[PDB]
Structure 1
Amino acid sequence: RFLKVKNWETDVVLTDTLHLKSTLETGCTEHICMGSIMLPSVATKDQLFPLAKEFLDQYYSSIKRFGSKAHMDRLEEVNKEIESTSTYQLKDTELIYGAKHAWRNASRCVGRIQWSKLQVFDARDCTTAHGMFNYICNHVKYATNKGNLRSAITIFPQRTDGKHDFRVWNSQLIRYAGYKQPDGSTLGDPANVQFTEICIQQGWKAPRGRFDVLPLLLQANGNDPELFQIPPELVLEVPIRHPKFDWFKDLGLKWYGLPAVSNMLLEIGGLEFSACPFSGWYMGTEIGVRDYCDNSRYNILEEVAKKMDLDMRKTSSLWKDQALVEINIAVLYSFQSDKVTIVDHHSATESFIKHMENEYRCRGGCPADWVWIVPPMSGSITPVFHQEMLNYRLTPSFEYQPDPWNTHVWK
């Protein structure tokens, strides 16, 4: 009931009581552990007040006014509005708290040392897909900041009935397009080949190349979604070169500065924000390892090993490992030479251990998903490999949600 986690590199031991405040379930039982399953899985008015009271009780327990008059009146005020409308509305202050703590509680996020430096843009007055486009452009501009990236989230009107949801249909606001070929192979990004076809099915004229920024598909208050093209001056991009290999320029790769994830669901005191694009910056390995070297992604280990002139006959020459290190040296180098914010897996994983120490001390714990925290290269030479982590679900939280082209009633 007061579990211990250990670091098997420093022998540092931390004690977790926060997990007791945990609410939702994990997927594991006493007889099976599902910690490596990828995907871990209308709200009546009855259910809504406990969640509202729970959230409000921790919000006032955080500004050091827990149970005071201002708390009990806001507790009754929300009670009365849930009676009235069977739902309710968050103060601007409650929206910033919730949003910031959804991130704080994201157990798969290695960058949470930043969780309280987050810029919350309230788009709950938005009503049209054009207004969404506007808010999203102002998000991209603000968060990019000439390469000095700043974390931000734009929060669109909460779900109400279920048939009038605001959704961004892009998985990320900025994403490269994918096109299959006559021979079957894939130009651009193979991850987005279906979404790219949806945008074309809706009128996008594709500039069928590799690094084509996709248009925004925006669904407002349940209406069929509409295409908008981000002004290209707002899409900052980093051409990838190596500090040694001048043919690495000839490789002709480039990535975008701003990772801005738009397909998730933000849960605050029982309320559901189905459109809530959030952005920070990249850990280097997301691009260098996964985007560039996942077999089903850009898959450049073949080509980089060729230009490096490597023993590509034997699996056991570690030519794959060799070309992967250089690819991530280049991504880091390129981003830093252009003054565009990026973080390497060593700096990022060190900061998380330091972040973990702060959470166990001033909060009683820190939910963490080892399968996701440990970087996808060089696992054990980073300090998170050697750190035991307790995973549990706290709220406010970010959740997965189905893609809207399977849910939506079309016209």
Structure 2
Amino acid sequence: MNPKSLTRGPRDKPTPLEELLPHAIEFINQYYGSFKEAKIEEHLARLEAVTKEIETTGTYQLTLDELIFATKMAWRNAPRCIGRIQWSNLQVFDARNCSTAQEMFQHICRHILYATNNGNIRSAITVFPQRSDGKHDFRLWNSQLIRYAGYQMPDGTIRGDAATLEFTQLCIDLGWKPRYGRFDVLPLVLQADGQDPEVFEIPPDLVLEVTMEYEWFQELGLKWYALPAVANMLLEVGGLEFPACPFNGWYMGNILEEINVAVLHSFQKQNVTIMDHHTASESFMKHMQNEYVLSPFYYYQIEPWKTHIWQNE
């Protein structure tokens, strides 16, 4: 077999023009090929301008429409994603002129806001600036925008998310004051322009949680977040790399002390979208109505605290 790697790592120099140009040209062709006969003079015009822009600046910028096209195509090129069947239902937020972590934070708040929509979930992606030389990367160190903290008890026990134990400790190491619940929402750990990450609490009113509701099992205090958002992948398109491009959909669906009726009832009763038969038909219908090496592609990355060179720990 000759599978490709699903990971795209860091750089420390711009992509060499001899690599970038061919990829850029191929994407431009893919994009204008989305008409099948229309816009041959526009195609050639754009090919010439991109090639001149690359040769004069060392890189190039996508138009808004090309970016939107690229995020949707990357989505339908995601083999594992079940939601990609209705891939035209994606809202794009262009944050490519973002310069600071504070600004990153505000963009992310807007995303969570729009996407959550009081439970009537909407799919969205926010695209931050593309990699330049690889030393000014924008990154979210989170794996998800919303995820619970994980604590290892003085027993060797796991309290919270058993999968975030390492990231939670890194937040503490960065100044985040550890509460010790099993449902603590991790802060946003945001890197702008290649600099050390800054910690931002997520305003709690922005976090919609499904409180699970027999009758005594709500006494357990079982709870989960409504918005599944992937924070850590890199969007590749036409030779360009976007190391920060958080996106979301909605959900598909060990001290037990096993029916999923509690979750099924809690989500659906609290009007939080999930991928049931109603939503599947409704969303595919909206999708269909919108019709009036893989690339682009979402890559995995190397966890940034393993590769980051700290300016001033």
1:15-36 residue CA offsets vs partner (Å, 9 max, x unmatched): xxxxxxxxxx6259xxxxxxxx
1:63 deviates by: 3.5
Residue 109 of structure 1, aligned match among 69, 81, 84: 81
**What amino acid does structure 2 have at the position aligned with 1:403?**
E
| Residue matched to 1:26 | 3
Report the Cα distance in structure 2 between the residues aligned to 1:131 and 1:193, rounded to whole angstroms: 28
Task: State the SS of the aligned residue for 2:163.
Answer: helix
| Residue matched to 2:199 | 227
Residue 253 of structure 1, aligned match among 204, 222, 233: 222
| Residue matched to 1:334 | 266
Q: Which runs of 5+ in 2 are unaligned?
A: none
The alignment status of 1:407 with 2:307, answered yes or no, reads yes
Residue 138 of structure 2, aligned match among 154, 166, 169: 166
Report the Cα distance in structure 1 between the residues aligned to 2:8 and 2:113, rounded to whole angstroms: 33
CA contact (8 A) 2:236 2:295 kept: yes
Report the Cα distance in structure 1 between the residues aligned to 2:120 and 2:37, rounded to whole angstroms: 36
| Residue matched to 1:367 | none
Report the Cα distance in structure 2 between the residues aligned to 1:75 and 1:193, rounded to whole angstroms: 48
Report the Cα distance in structure 1 between the residues aligned to 2:300 and 2:129, rounded to whole angstroms: 17
Report the Cα distance in structure 2 between the residues aligned to 1:276 and 1:179, rounded to whole angstroms: 28
| Residue matched to 1:129 | 101
Task: State the SS of the aligned residue for 1:340.
Answer: coil
The alignment status of 1:283 with 2:249, answered yes or no, reads no
Overall identity of the aligned pairs, in %: 60
The alignment status of 1:94 with 2:66, answered yes or no, reads yes
1:95-120 residue CA offsets vs partner (Å, 9 max, x unmatched): 00001110011001011122101000
CA contact (8 A) 2:148 2:186 kept: yes
CA contact (8 A) 1:266 1:398 kept: yes
- Summarize the Cα distance change of 1:40–1:137 in structure 2 as closer, same or farther, 3 Å threshold: closer
1:64 deviates by: 4.4
CA contact (8 A) 2:8 2:299 kept: no
Report the Cα distance in structure 1 between the residues aligned to 2:191 and 2:308, rounded to whole angstroms: 10
CA contact (8 A) 2:116 2:227 kept: yes
Would you identify which runs of 4 or more consecutive aligned residues in structure 1 move more than 6 Å? 38-41
Task: State the SS of the aligned residue for 1:111.
Answer: helix
1:112-140 residue CA offsets vs partner (Å, 9 max, x unmatched): 12210100000001000000000000000
| Residue matched to 2:233 | 264
Report the Cα distance in structure 1 between the residues aligned to 2:135 and 2:162, rounded to whole angstroms: 31
Task: State the SS of the aligned residue for 1:282.
Answer: coil
| Residue matched to 1:57 | 29
Report the Cα distance in structure 1 between the residues aligned to 2:232 and 2:157, rounded to whole angstroms: 27
Task: State the SS of the aligned residue for 1:339.
Answer: coil
Report the Cα distance in structure 2 between the residues aligned to 1:188 and 1:202, rounded to whole angstroms: 19
**What amino acid does structure 2 have at the position aligned with 1:121?**
F
CA contact (8 A) 1:148 1:341 kept: yes
**What amino acid does structure 2 have at the position aligned with 1:341?**
T
What do you get for the CA RMSD once the two structures are aligned? 2.3
Report the Cα distance in structure 1 between the residues aligned to 2:296 and 2:3, rounded to whole angstroms: 15
| Residue matched to 2:54 | 82
Q: How does the TM-score come out when normalised to structure 2? A: 0.90
| Residue matched to 1:397 | 297
1:193-243 residue CA offsets vs partner (Å, 9 max, x unmatched): 1100111101001111110111000000101010111111111000112xx
1:407 deviates by: 1.1
CA contact (8 A) 1:26 1:40 kept: no
| Residue matched to 1:216 | 188
CA contact (8 A) 1:238 1:254 kept: yes
- Summarize the Cα distance change of 1:118–1:264 in structure 2 as closer, same or farther, 3 Å threshold: same
Q: Which runs of 5+ in 1 are unaligned?
A: 1-24, 29-37, 285-298, 307-322, 363-392
Report the Cα distance in structure 2 between the residues aligned to 1:398 and 1:155, rounded to whole angstroms: 12
**What amino acid does structure 1 have at the position aligned with 2:301?**
Q
Task: State the SS of the aligned residue for 1:255.
Answer: strand
1:347 deviates by: 7.2
Report the Cα distance in structure 2 between the residues aligned to 1:65 and 1:126, rounded to whole angstroms: 36
- Summarize the Cα distance change of 1:196–1:187 in structure 2 as closer, same or farther, 3 Å threshold: same
| Residue matched to 2:168 | 196
